[PDB]
Design an enzyme around this catalytic site. Structure first.
Site, PDB file in Angstrom:
ATOM      1  N   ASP B  69       0.847  -1.190   0.000  1.00 51.67           N
ATOM      2  CA  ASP B  69       0.000   0.000   0.000  1.00 51.67           C
ATOM      3  C   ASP B  69       0.892   1.252   0.000  1.00 51.67           C
ATOM      4  OD1 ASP B  69       0.478  -0.619   2.915  1.00 51.67           O
ATOM      5  OD2 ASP B  69      -0.878   0.979   3.398  1.00 51.67           O
ATOM      6  N   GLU B 134      -0.033  -0.937   5.919  1.00 52.83           N
ATOM      7  CA  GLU B 134       0.996  -0.469   6.793  1.00 52.83           C
ATOM      8  C   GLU B 134       0.824   1.061   7.013  1.00 52.83           C
ATOM      9  OE1 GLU B 134       3.776   1.789   6.130  1.00 52.83           O
ATOM     10  OE2 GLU B 134       4.466   1.677   8.206  1.00 52.83           O
TER      11      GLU B 134
END
Lengths: 375, 375
Positions: B69, B134
């Site tokens: 991400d 994250e």
């Protein structure tokens, strides 16, 4: 123990004159006083009604000053009795304007009647300077009237502003001036950054800290016989984006001084800059001053007010300059001596505002005692 | 000089995997590595995709950790090149995720392929612990994978998290731990009042001043071999109603500590309370701790990273625990030794994010070098 001051008070209080709506309080006064030699000069600006009522043409000129407007009542149902429906209860007169300041107005009108009836050939003159905007922005009230009067040299010798000045018992305190007011809008400059990399930022809360402590512990002056020490207070402080992992780039601080004659506007600004600069603070600072201190030292007016109080109330009045301010700040530029004298201010601008019933006739009697002594 | 790391980097960068949308990056990775014996165990929780990829069944287990991400790009027209269309320009690869942290992922994938081809009978195991969350709240990402792995005693000997750790030159810095984070939400109590009657109010900005100075001047600890001194920073400060003639009744302060192993959470809370109490401050104080400090001291993993960097980049790498944190805060609980090593973090989360083109092949080479020394 006349009952007329009480009745005029109720009538005035029954008019819902929330600033800047006069509700024809001034019309009623002008007609009542016209009966005993008072001429009326209306001075209306914008939506504010102002009026100069005067009887006589020579010095000494004694002026009662006051305002017919009252602050907003807030939710009407929270009052124990309708704010605009004067009610007598437990030795008190309740209603908006009972303390600030319709009772005083009523008390001086009746004092004028008893005095003029008793002393038809009195020397000098009597005037009333009334505004419908003392509680609001007041751009179009008293200040404009003072300008007209000062412009044509129609000056006042002794002025009594009817604001409520008592701490508790009627006559225990009279105001002989007010502190000046100097405000600052400080923007401390830092450098925004991520909280985890402090070396890449400048935290304005941390750079301001040592100056904030020095400012808040500073003793500005000693006060003197008429004033308490100059007072510094921070009203607002705001820095940050709301993010708890960010170091703000700037901090805004709003502060104010209520200053006495022991300090000057210039001196105080110089000292604030000196404290910020010695701690290396980087900033922008805008100043605003809404007025300088004004004072009437002990003289004939304070002596007569004290004598009138001693006779009517049996107590020794103290002189004071504390608290807020009033239209006396505008009128002092045109009156040689000016004091403020009225009933307890404990409930001003609160729900269930009131005045002790017995203080009513005593206040009118004090005012009458003052006209006797000056005229 | 291989060009496979660069091509995988671009492929990854072209997928708009804004948290927590994986956009099939893990599927591309799982199919590619399946050819060389990496089995795949998907561990999807809620809207987050996580995957444990592993080649081998015995210790030592070497794990590369990372996230697919990327943070939002902000308005697309402000970038010089479309954030999701990887472009080579002026010796740099531009695109969202080029630094954080798709290049690293691509570089470890190719390192595995070259290493497995060169060392088919290598001892131990190689694993990839990848998450699609994250950068956000991360409630269903790496932490859930760790819990699953720890629960069945499937532990890691050496973990390399691919976050960008370089200051400038690839390999100049490696992270071997991170500070803990302890936050406080302080509400200083005073008593609202009119600014002109200071004796009837309690200014919380003035009562907090001496404690604010002491907190901002405090030295919390000395730091040590691996960490800088514990750092205290105020992120927000707000008091006041906006009126400049009012003394606020309360003051809100948000602060944070990025703390090292020289201090404890309890000790730091005790000290803040002791400073506020000695200055007689009245308040409420809520604490929140998002993690304790974590550290891998000098050992086999740091020595191998340093040796691989020296061979590949010709420089001496420094160990560091500064900055923010990573998913190493969750993985350290299951990995005996853990470090972070990736390209320059100068442009992470910024428009025109990028990585040096020549640093790409070198980073894959370093990762391969680490694989050779551990397995």
């Amino acid at each position: 123990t006349e009952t007329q001051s009480l009745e005029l008070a109720k009538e005035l209080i029954s008019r819902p004159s929330v600033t800047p709506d006069d509700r024809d309080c001034q019309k009623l006064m002008a007609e009542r006083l016209h009966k005993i030699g008072f001429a009326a000069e209306e001075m209306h600006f914008g939506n504010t009604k102002n009026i100069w009522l005067r009887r006589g043409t020579k010095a000494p000129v004694v002026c009662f000053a006051g305002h017919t407007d009252v602050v907003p009542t807030g939710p009407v149902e929270k009052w124990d009795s309708p704010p605009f429906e004067p009610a007598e209860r437990d030795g008190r007169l309740y209603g908006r304007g009972a303390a600030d300041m319709k009772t005083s107005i009523a008390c001086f009108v009746t004092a004028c009647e008893r005095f003029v009836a008793k002393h038809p050939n009195h020397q000098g003159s009597i005037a009333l300077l009334i505004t419908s905007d003392e509680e609001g922005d007041a751009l179009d009230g008293t200040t404009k009237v003072v300008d007209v009067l000062k412009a044509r040299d129609e000056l006042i010798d002794y002025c009594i502003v009817g604001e409520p000045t008592a701490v508790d018992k009627l006559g225990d305190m009279i105001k002989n001036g007010r502190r000046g007011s100097l405000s600052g809008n400080l923007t401390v400059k830092g450098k925004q950054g991520h909280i985890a990399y402090p070396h890449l930022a400048i935290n304005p809360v941390h750079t301001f800290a040592p100056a904030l402590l020095e400012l808040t512990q500073e003793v500005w002056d000693e006060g003197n016989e008429y004033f308490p020490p100059t007072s510094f207070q921070i009203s607002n402080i705001n820095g940050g984006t709301g993010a708890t992992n960010v170091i703000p780039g700037e901090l805004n601080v709003k502060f104010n001084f209520r200053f006495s004659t022991e300090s000057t506007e210039a001196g105080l600004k110089q000292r604030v800059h000196a404290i910020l600069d010695k701690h290396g603070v980087q900033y922008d600072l805008q100043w605003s001053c809404s007025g300088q201190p004004f004072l009437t030292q002990a003289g004939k007016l304070t002596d007569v007010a004290r004598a009138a109080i001693a006779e009517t109330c049996g107590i020794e009045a103290e002189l004071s300059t504390t608290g807020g301010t009033s239209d006396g700040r505008f009128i002092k530029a045109m009156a040689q001596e000016l004091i403020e004298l009225g009933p307890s201010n404990a409930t001003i601008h609160q729900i269930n505002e009131n005045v002790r019933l017995n203080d009513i006739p005593k206040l009118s009697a004090v005012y009458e005692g003052i006209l006797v002594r000056l005229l």
